[PDB]
Amino acid sequence: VSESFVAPLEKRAENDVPLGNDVPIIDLQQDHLVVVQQITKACQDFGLFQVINHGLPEKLMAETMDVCKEFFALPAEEKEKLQPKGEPAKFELPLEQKAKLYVEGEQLEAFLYWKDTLAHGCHPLDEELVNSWPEKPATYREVVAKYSVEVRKLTMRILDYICEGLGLKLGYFDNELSQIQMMLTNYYPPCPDPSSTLGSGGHYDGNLITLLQQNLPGLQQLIAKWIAVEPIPTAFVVNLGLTLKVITNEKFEGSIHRVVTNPTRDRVSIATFIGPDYSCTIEPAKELLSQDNPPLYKPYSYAEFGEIYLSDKSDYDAGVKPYKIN
Ligand SMILES: CN1[C@H]2C[C@H](OC(=O)[C@H](CO)c3ccccc3)C[C@@H]1[C@@H](O)C2
Ligand SMILES: [Sr+2]
Ligand SMILES: [Sr+2]
Ligand SMILES: [V+3]
């Protein structure tokens, strides 16, 4: 690998990361109250859990993964149509909702992630948005339209379980706090030296909540002990974001996680990031505050948070450090 992709010594993955046997696998077809309670325990203690029997068609999951892998198999001449000015876009504001290929890294010891990313908005689905999506493969738009609607449906169910668990009214997040739905498809090609590379560096998701679909190993969670998140192809991995951490006044944990590279086989993952518009104000939910539970963050601009989050990776919570109070 070129030196571009060489991570700093302290950020490199150990070669023998154990399976996380205490990662909660939550069956959404249990009784309502049991689902609320198990989800609540997972959010308070871990911030990362898998959902099964989640009501999203397994057939559609397999079809979306097929069309995403078909996309990354396309020749250079097709992929160039998604590279503004002949190169991949950067994860910086303004973050546009039209489909683009992205490159990602850290600017500390500057290095690149061993990863290609397709990203686009998904909400609301209109003709203009879908017309900005990939033209090839032919089925991408119709498959990923159905997927994004279904994934949102599931995400809003999970948020309402979360509302019940916290004692917030149902629909608390069904507003400006869940307005942006970015779908990222990540392609990790084989890496000849996995010891010095990362598919994705350690991070909280900056948004509210993320659903991640995987069928191969590579996802790891920090619990300074890293563990491997068992890939269940028919499950979704639920990652609680830094925004939900702030809004719950740290009653919920955020998921700190990373992706390691593989020397022999490639990997494709699908991540749906739901969260606020860049115009939102984020603060601890007033309904939960008291003299016993005083706010640990002052109100802040999501845009202003966005800029720090995407640029400064000196600390996992660099984005929210300026707004910490008490
Ligand atoms: C490792 N990178 C982090 C930053 C960026 O994330 C995004 O692109 C999301 C998309 O919602 C975002 C969240 C919060 C603020 C801005 C962007 C791309 C990827 C993600 O896995 C998380
Ligand atoms: Sr190019
Ligand atoms: Sr177009
Ligand atoms: V993530």
DSSP notation for 5-37:
G---GGGSPPS-PPB-TTS-EEETTS-HHHHHH
- Which of 101, 89, 99, 102 lies closest to 135, judged by CA? 99
| Nearest atom, ligand 1, residue 203 CA | 1
Strand order in the sheet with 200-204: 200-204, 256-259, 219-222, 226-228
Token representation of residue 180: 């942006």
- Ligand 1-lining residues (CB < 6 angstroms): 91, 95, 104, 182, 200, 203, 205-207, 273, 275, 306, 309-310
Give the separation between CA 279 and CA 257, rounded to whole angstroms.
27
Domain boundaries defined on the chain:
3-278
Give the separation between CA 280 and CA 72, rounded to whole angstroms.
34
Ligand 3 centroid to residue 305 C-alpha, Å: 31
- Experimental method used, please? X-ray
Hey, which bits of 93-218 come out as E strands?
100-103, 105-106, 111-112, 116-121, 180-188, 200-204, 209-213
Ligand 1 centroid to residue 95 C-alpha, Å: 10
Looking up tokens 């779908």, which residue turns up?
A: 183
| Nearest atom, ligand 1, residue 243 CA | 14
Looking up tokens 């879908």, which residue turns up?
A: 130
Q: CB within 8 A of 271, min separation 6: which ones? A: 183, 184, 185, 186, 210, 211, 212, 213
Token representation of residue 21: 């046997």
Length of the chain, please? 326
- The CA-CA-CA angle for residues 238, 79, 220, to 5°, reads 25
Looking up tokens 């350690």, which residue turns up?
A: 202
Q: Is 186 annotated as a binding residue?
A: yes
Looking up tokens 């150990």, which residue turns up?
A: 14
- SS3 breakdown of the chain: % helix, strand, coil, rounded to 5? 30, 25, 45
DSSP single-letter state for residue 86: G
According to CATH, the superfamily of the domain at 3-278 is B-lactam Antibiotic, Isopenicillin N Synthase; Chain (2.60.120.330)
Q: CB within 8 A of 85, min separation 6: which ones? A: none
Give the separation between CA 37 and CA 43, rounded to whole angstroms.
10
Token representation of residue 99: 């489909």
The answer to whether 144 touches 125, Cβ cutoff 8 Å, is no
Ligand 3 centroid to residue 98 C-alpha, Å: 9
Q: Is 215 annotated as a binding residue?
A: no
Q: What letters, b where the CB count within 10 A reaches 16 and e where it falls short, cover 160-189?
A: bbbbbbbebeeebbeeebbbbbbbbbbbbe
Ligand 4 centroid to residue 78 C-alpha, Å: 27
The answer to whether 91 touches 102, Cβ cutoff 8 Å, is yes
Three-state SS at 56: coil
CA 40 to chain CA centroid, nearest Å: 19
